[PDB]
Design an enzyme around this catalytic site. Sequence first.
Site, PDB file in Angstrom:
ATOM      1  N   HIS A  59      47.902  49.548  36.604  1.00 21.33           N
ATOM      2  CA  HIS A  59      46.516  49.894  36.370  1.00 21.33           C
ATOM      3  C   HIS A  59      45.521  49.358  37.526  1.00 21.33           C
ATOM      4  O   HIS A  59      44.962  48.347  37.173  1.00 21.33           O
ATOM      5  CB  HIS A  59      46.005  49.368  35.076  1.00 21.33           C
ATOM      6  CG  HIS A  59      46.391  48.085  34.723  1.00 21.33           C
ATOM      7  ND1 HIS A  59      46.288  47.585  33.348  1.00 21.33           N
ATOM      8  CD2 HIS A  59      46.770  46.883  35.474  1.00 21.33           C
ATOM      9  CE1 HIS A  59      46.382  46.229  33.421  1.00 21.33           C
ATOM     10  NE2 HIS A  59      46.883  45.847  34.387  1.00 21.33           N
ATOM     11  N   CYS A 113      40.741  42.899  40.546  1.00 23.71           N
ATOM     12  CA  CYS A 113      41.615  42.229  39.459  1.00 23.71           C
ATOM     13  C   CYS A 113      42.853  41.413  40.309  1.00 23.71           C
ATOM     14  O   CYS A 113      42.789  41.523  41.316  1.00 23.71           O
ATOM     15  CB  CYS A 113      42.214  43.078  38.517  1.00 23.71           C
ATOM     16  SG  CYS A 113      42.211  42.341  36.810  1.00 23.71           S
ATOM     17  N   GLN A 131      44.642  45.537  25.920  1.00 24.37           N
ATOM     18  CA  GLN A 131      44.252  46.806  25.491  1.00 24.37           C
ATOM     19  C   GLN A 131      45.284  47.607  24.981  1.00 24.37           C
ATOM     20  O   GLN A 131      46.135  48.141  25.552  1.00 24.37           O
ATOM     21  CB  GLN A 131      43.543  47.261  26.605  1.00 24.37           C
ATOM     22  CG  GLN A 131      43.742  46.805  27.949  1.00 24.37           C
ATOM     23  CD  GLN A 131      45.056  46.831  28.215  1.00 24.37           C
ATOM     24  OE1 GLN A 131      46.071  47.069  27.484  1.00 24.37           O
ATOM     25  NE2 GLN A 131      45.539  46.145  29.580  1.00 24.37           N
ATOM     26  N   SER A 154      37.125  49.054  30.486  1.00 27.11           N
ATOM     27  CA  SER A 154      36.674  48.351  31.631  1.00 27.11           C
ATOM     28  C   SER A 154      35.983  49.186  32.632  1.00 27.11           C
ATOM     29  O   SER A 154      34.964  48.704  33.264  1.00 27.11           O
ATOM     30  CB  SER A 154      38.082  48.065  32.146  1.00 27.11           C
ATOM     31  OG  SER A 154      38.246  46.500  32.325  1.00 27.11           O
ATOM     32  N   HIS A 157      40.983  53.035  35.375  1.00 25.70           N
ATOM     33  CA  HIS A 157      42.248  52.360  35.754  1.00 25.70           C
ATOM     34  C   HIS A 157      43.154  53.720  36.298  1.00 25.70           C
ATOM     35  O   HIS A 157      42.857  54.819  36.237  1.00 25.70           O
ATOM     36  CB  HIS A 157      42.799  51.489  35.019  1.00 25.70           C
ATOM     37  CG  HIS A 157      42.161  50.653  34.180  1.00 25.70           C
ATOM     38  ND1 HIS A 157      41.695  49.334  34.650  1.00 25.70           N
ATOM     39  CD2 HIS A 157      41.026  50.932  33.133  1.00 25.70           C
ATOM     40  CE1 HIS A 157      40.728  48.942  33.764  1.00 25.70           C
ATOM     41  NE2 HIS A 157      40.600  49.844  32.726  1.00 25.70           N
TER      42      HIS A 157
END
Length: 163
Positions: A59, A113, A131, A154, A157
């Site tokens: 992701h 990330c 999640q 978030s 993704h």
Amino acid sequence: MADEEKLPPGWEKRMSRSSGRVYYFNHITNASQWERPSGNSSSGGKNGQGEPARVRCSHLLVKHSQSRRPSSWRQEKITRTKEEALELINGYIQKIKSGEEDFESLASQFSDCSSAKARGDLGAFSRGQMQKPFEDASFALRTGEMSGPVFTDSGIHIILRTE
């Protein structure tokens, strides 16, 4: 993560520069395996799995105004917003899965990330990572299909998946 090992906790992959069946290493049971990390399904290998309870469902994460902090790894500034967030993804969404772009570059030159400098956010799991609404992606394609904009807690993704 997603740079050294490529398996669950307990079993490590060495590859070994020599054919003759692939072996594995353990620790929780000081026992050397020589088959495959089986337990829930038939992950890794290449394909063939009816009950895929574990995949490399990734992701990507493109920094933007819809993140903890709109800061560019290089640019050092990201004034743009959702106006270029979902769009920026569409720019590659139709290229990476076209067998004309390996899943890694974008992560090693965009991702914020862990995938940023870890050739992958997380990689593969055993059942669940985080999640719950995120897991609802990998199990919805036929490998190398990319889930695209899943929309979670978030921003935006991309579940490329490599298994």
